[PDB]
Amino acid sequence: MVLYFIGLGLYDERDITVKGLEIAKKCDYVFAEFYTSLMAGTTMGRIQKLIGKEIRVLSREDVELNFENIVLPLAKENDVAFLTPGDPLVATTHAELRIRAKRAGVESYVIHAPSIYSAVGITGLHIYKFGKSATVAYPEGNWFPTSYYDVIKENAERGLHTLLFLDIKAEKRMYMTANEAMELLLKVEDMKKGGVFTDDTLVVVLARAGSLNPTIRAGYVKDLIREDFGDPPHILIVPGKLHIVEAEYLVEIAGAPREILRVNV
Amino acid sequence: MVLYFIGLGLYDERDITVKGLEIAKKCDYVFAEFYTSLMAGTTMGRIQKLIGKEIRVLSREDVELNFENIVLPLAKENDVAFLTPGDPLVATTHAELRIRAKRAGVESYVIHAPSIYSAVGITGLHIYKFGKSATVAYPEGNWFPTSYYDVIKENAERGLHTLLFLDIKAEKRMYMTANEAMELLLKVEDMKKGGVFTDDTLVVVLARAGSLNPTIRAGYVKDLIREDFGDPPHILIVPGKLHIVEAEYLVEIAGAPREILRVNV
Ligand SMILES: Nc1ncnc2c1ncn2[C@@H]1O[C@H](CSCC[C@H](N)C(=O)O)[C@@H](O)[C@H]1O
Numbered sequence: 001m002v003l004y005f006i007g008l009g010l011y012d013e014r015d016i017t018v019k020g021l022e023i024a025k026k027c028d029y030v031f032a033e034f035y036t037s038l039m040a041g042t043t044m045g046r047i048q049k050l051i052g053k054e055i056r057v058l059s060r061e062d063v064e065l066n067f068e069n070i071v072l073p074l075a076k077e078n079d080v081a082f083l084t085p086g087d088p089l090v091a092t093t094h095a096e097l098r099i100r101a102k103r104a105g106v107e108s109y110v111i112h113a114p115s116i117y118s119a120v121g122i123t124g125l126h127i128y129k130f131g132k133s134a135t136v137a138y139p140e141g142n143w144f145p146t147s148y149y150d151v152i153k154e155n156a157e158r159g160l161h162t163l164l165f166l167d168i169k170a171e172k173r174m175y176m177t178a179n180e181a182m183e184l185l186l187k188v189e190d191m192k193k194g195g196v197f198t199d200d201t202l203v204v205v206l207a208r209a210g211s212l213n214p215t216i217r218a219g220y221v222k223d224l225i226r227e228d229f230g231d232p233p234h235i236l237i238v239p240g241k242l243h244i245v246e247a248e249y250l251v252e253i254a255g256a257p258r259e260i261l262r263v264n265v
Numbered sequence: 266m267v268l269y270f271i272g273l274g275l276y277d278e279r280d281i282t283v284k285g286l287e288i289a290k291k292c293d294y295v296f297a298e299f300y301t302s303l304m305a306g307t308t309m310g311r312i313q314k315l316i317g318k319e320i321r322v323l324s325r326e327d328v329e330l331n332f333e334n335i336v337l338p339l340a341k342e343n344d345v346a347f348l349t350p351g352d353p354l355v356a357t358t359h360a361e362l363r364i365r366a367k368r369a370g371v372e373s374y375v376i377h378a379p380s381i382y383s384a385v386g387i388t389g390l391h392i393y394k395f396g397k398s399a400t401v402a403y404p405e406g407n408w409f410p411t412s413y414y415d416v417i418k419e420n421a422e423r424g425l426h427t428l429l430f431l432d433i434k435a436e437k438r439m440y441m442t443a444n445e446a447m448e449l450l451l452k453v454e455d456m457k458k459g460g461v462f463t464d465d466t467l468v469v470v471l472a473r474a475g476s477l478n479p480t481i482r483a484g485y486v487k488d489l490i491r492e493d494f495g496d497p498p499h500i501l502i503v504p505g506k507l508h509i510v511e512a513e514y515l516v517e518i519a520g521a522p523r524e525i526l527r528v529n530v
């Protein structure tokens with residue numbers, strides 16, 4: 001009679017850890033949410049088939065407002081699993097659900113899975129050099145979010161790389177592309193004019209990490225802003241000062257202009 | 266003709282993903298390295314039994330100096346797997362190994378797995394608030410390194426969390442304990458006196474991330490410095506100012522003192 005938070009990983013149903021699969025297979029009830037991220041290489045059927053259990057999908061409202069009414073009650077008399085894309089506690093507010101479980105007398109366990117936060121390593125940028133992260137959110141009505149622009153500025157001044165999670169509106173099947181994120185950032189630049197994000201800014205795009213052939217591209221905004229990086233999900237990265245081997249990787253593996261091999265120490 | 270970089274995950278042999286396991290089983294040759302880290306919850310034998318292939322272990326020198334003479338030759342006429350703890354390419358020098366593959370006319374693919382960079386989300390600390398990461402190294406001889414102290418300073422100064430990796434002697438199987446890390450930092454604080462790490466500093470200790478029963482403890486240095494966090498490996502985190510939700514999780518899940526709800530928020 002416990003609750004398991006089990007990550008499903010980056011791209012398809014095979015990105016779940018063996019540990020997660022074995023445990024998921026032996027749970028009495030299986031719940032899941034697919035609004036915090038997008039697993040572009042799988043479907044509900046494939047996941048249900050792999051786990052061998054019927055999966056009840058919950059909405060953001062079901063979770064944020066009724067987790068303790070839909071999931072926890074069952075976690076008292078049975079073993080329950082709650083599945084999520086990537087790692088369940090990364091760039092989500094799911095950690096708080098563990099507090100709800102405790103207060104309801106339910107013990108919980110977390111089974112990790114590969115996350116986009118560490119998968120950034122495939123870009124060649126040293127992961128320890130990443131600074132504060134941020135999310136490029138879709139403007140809504142007259143409200144136009146811009147704090148993420150300041151994060152980049154803060155990190156850049158320190159020579160640190162900036163990881164930019166991109167917005168997602170699962171109910172509308174909307175997945176922000178790196179292209180759209182670049183557009184929004186250029187608009188904020190005109191606004192603030194801090195010289196933080198312009199056509200000459202070097203950026204890195206990682207799309208569909210977890211698949212065997214993810215799209216990894218590096219170059220100047222003026223050149224990538226209109227490039228096609230394939231289907232979502234995408235993440236955008238604004239590197240800080242580059243190490244020679246980081247630049248070499250971006251050129252050799254990500255197709256960056258050979259000129260970035262020259263670093264301005 | 267193909268080299269697969271496969272992550273083994275966090276703690277035991279089941280932390281590898283289903284994708285990683287199936288691919289490894291289809292490879293003609295399987296190599297592994299355990300100098301960047303060492304699965305404390307398993308053994309070479311258990312990993313070997315799980316994959317069903319003999320696993321040739323490579324030293325740091327085998328990889329860094331001879332990757333192209335040991336692994337790549339076989340990758341030309343067979344499918345080869347290179348196993349590493351955590352997520353492949355997180356370790357700073359691994360990314361360039363892909364450049365070596367390319368240079369040798371060998372295609373490479375990356376199979377991700379849980380990394381400590383994302384697993385620390387289990388501490389309840391928001392992932393986006395983490396800043397630059399660092400490693401606490403043992404002083405020795407006339408060398409007393411202290412850069413990790415400066416990292417904590419720059420991060421905390423901006424309200425960001427600092428993820429600290431603790432020194433490890435893979436060969437001698439010696440792990441630096443969180444307790445030892447604190448002592449070193451207090452000693453560095455006495456040296457630099459910047460008001461960065463003192464007895465009143467709040468810290469979080471994560472041990473055996475990945476296992477079903479990890480150790481998650483949060484508190485002030487004066488109380489945790491002599492606490493027993495169990496067997497390695499230990500990860501230390503110096504949080505920046507907390508979001509009430511982070512503090513609540515640390516209190517309810519990591520046994521942190523109520524005091525953080527008013528002092529560190
Ligand atoms: N496979 C993938 N490839 C590229 N970006 C990804 C991705 N998975 C997640 N993301 C990025 O992260 C956002 C979701 S944020 C939630 C992240 C998740 N808990 C994890 O551990 O990965 C997406 O909108 C996208 O910008």
Ligand code: NA
Pocket residue numbers: 127128130131382395396397398
């Ligand atoms: Na980081």
